[PDB]
Design a protein around this ligand. Sequence first.
Ligand code: ADP
Ligand code: ADP
Ligand code: DS0
Ligand code: DS0
Ligand code: MG
Ligand code: MG
Ligand code: MG
Ligand code: MG
Lengths: 315, 313
Amino acid sequence: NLCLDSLLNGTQDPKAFGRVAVLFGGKSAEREVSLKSGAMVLQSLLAAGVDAFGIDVGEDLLQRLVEEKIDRAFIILHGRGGEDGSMQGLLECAGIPYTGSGVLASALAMDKLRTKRVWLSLGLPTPDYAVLASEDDCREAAQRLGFPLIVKPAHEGSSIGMAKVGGLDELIAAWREAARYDSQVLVEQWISGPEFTVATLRGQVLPAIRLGTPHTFYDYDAKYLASDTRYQVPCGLDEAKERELKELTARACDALGIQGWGRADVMQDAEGRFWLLEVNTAPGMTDHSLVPMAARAAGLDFQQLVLAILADSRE
Amino acid sequence: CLDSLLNGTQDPKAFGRVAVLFGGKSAEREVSLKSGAMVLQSLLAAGVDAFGIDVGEDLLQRLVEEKIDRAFIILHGRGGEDGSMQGLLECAGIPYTGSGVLASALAMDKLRTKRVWLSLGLPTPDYAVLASEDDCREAAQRLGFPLIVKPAHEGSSIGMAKVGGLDELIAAWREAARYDSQVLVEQWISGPEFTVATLRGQVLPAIRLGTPHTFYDYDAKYLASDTRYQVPCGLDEAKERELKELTARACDALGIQGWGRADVMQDAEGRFWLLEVNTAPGMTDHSLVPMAARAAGLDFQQLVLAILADSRE
Ligand SMILES: Nc1ncnc2c1ncn2[C@@H]1O[C@H](COP(=O)(O)OP(=O)(O)O)[C@@H](O)[C@H]1O
Ligand SMILES: Nc1ncnc2c1ncn2[C@@H]1O[C@H](COP(=O)(O)OP(=O)(O)O)[C@@H](O)[C@H]1O
Ligand SMILES: N[C@@H]1CON=C1OP(=O)(O)O
Ligand SMILES: N[C@@H]1CON=C1OP(=O)(O)O
Ligand SMILES: [Mg+2]
Ligand SMILES: [Mg+2]
Ligand SMILES: [Mg+2]
Ligand SMILES: [Mg+2]
């Protein structure tokens, strides 16, 4: 449950966190988003008076880690190399405590196919889908699922490599484009209705946000470049519905082992049923970003939000 | 096919400089030290440009010093087969042997591994999660006796005990909780024990295990002199094929890559029960993957080279 008080815990002493390294950048397709998220986190942590410094994660990372003294690592990398468990395992081997989900949870939630597979085995709702690896797999998926469809790489974020398709020819093309980012490509049935995102923080589910864009879907341009994107807090859901969405988010995150914080993306169809899309374990922290927005609705500014994430890493 | 296992092993210099990672900080460090020594010595004798790293608080400094084209992971337990070392190597840009981050983390967790098996309808003993004395009492009522208690993330039978009554159930739970807050307990399977190695996607001959001890515990694995190893096992062709095929499904269910070793019990009616899968199996002189590799034809040098050759993908 949303308890503003217990959300802030190790928050009051920015000196007690030690020297904190903010890990951002990286070599994934979401690097540009990570840079903006890192600059935001580093600036807020510095203004809070924590012993913070930034590391653009690159080829010199292991050298950086042995040279600098580091008491805590705040992971704000996006995509593979940051959210997939690899950076988490590195920090565990380096004996450095870090923020967010563990190795297994991070690796699982990065894999949309494996995440959906876990969800289905627990009776949790997630759109029907197919795995695309050939033109024949596209013809099979188009036959069984109809149109429109949503094509996505399995290990991507920020809607990169994604496409809404209305025909088999558009589907084959969208499969070949996503395959440029990831040999694992999945296609989902298009859910028509409201889009919601649900942030979680230290085990607590934050107020849901309703999303809207004139674009065909919530794509890259709608997320970080456009200006006509609509964010509604509170979401227009009634009490019993927002509780249903919140309880569903908690079951979907718990099923993956999510820890510390995260953000769930959920669609709703014309009959009111919710459908789980993905879970992000190092969500964005830019100006356009949604976890900060749901935090403000909960009652925390951007400075208390990062300190709460940092304070959770102490267990 | 023994031709397929040996592919990419003809030229030992094609692997470049190979770092053997062993030791570690887990409860299985002593076993990993013996495993590392065997792997390192074999590689050097094969003409591989190999050297050893004792994984400790030193790790990152060694990795920025040494030139490494490939890493042979032969760590045991948490910090080694749990995806943590695999994740570091992928950040460092060093290719490595064995399963990946997700598969290693999954196989290290006996509970989630069992849950993955149950969801696919694969047999594995009925169990309970123990976090309190009440949990012990609930399990005793539902499961009966005897039972076997184990930590979720351990190996080499560390922290394990077979228990025949409720009083020793709770004692076994507290001892197992010294190694891991995640503790499970299974119904004891009375019958033959097997282990089944897998290599480069191929299931090797199964081995039958016996010991005077109440189970295949740490002493029976590395100290006693009277542990019994049967290759071929006394199973007929249809039953050993059944065992090999179930091993393949159980390993593929976890994403196991390169090599591994599955532990399987057989009850009094012939049915097989999956226990666990190890993603960096032991390579000591008491170890079972070298024994199953010899049953398939390969000597110790071909086994390590086959493992190394598979990591080139
Ligand atoms: N099955 C679907 N039905 C409708 N819209 C979808 C579907 N899958 C994805 N989308 C749209 O694509 C966006 C990105 O997809 P998502 O699965 O969240 O992955 P990511 O954001 O990591 O690329 C979502 O915000 C949503 O608007
Ligand atoms: N359900 C069971 N029934 C009978 N014996 C078991 C059972 N579970 C474990 N054992 C015994 O304990 C040993 C170790 O169990 P295992 O699950 O392989 O743990 P570890 O990872 O420590 O080897 C096995 O080799 C087997 O002899
Ligand atoms: N992966 C992105 C980057 O920050 N927030 C994330 O969530 P997503 O865009 O994948 O829905
Ligand atoms: N994890 C141990 C150490 O090396 N070999 C392993 O097999 P296990 O004892 O877990 O059955
Ligand atoms: Mg995402
Ligand atoms: Mg998303
Ligand atoms: Mg084991
Ligand atoms: Mg075992």
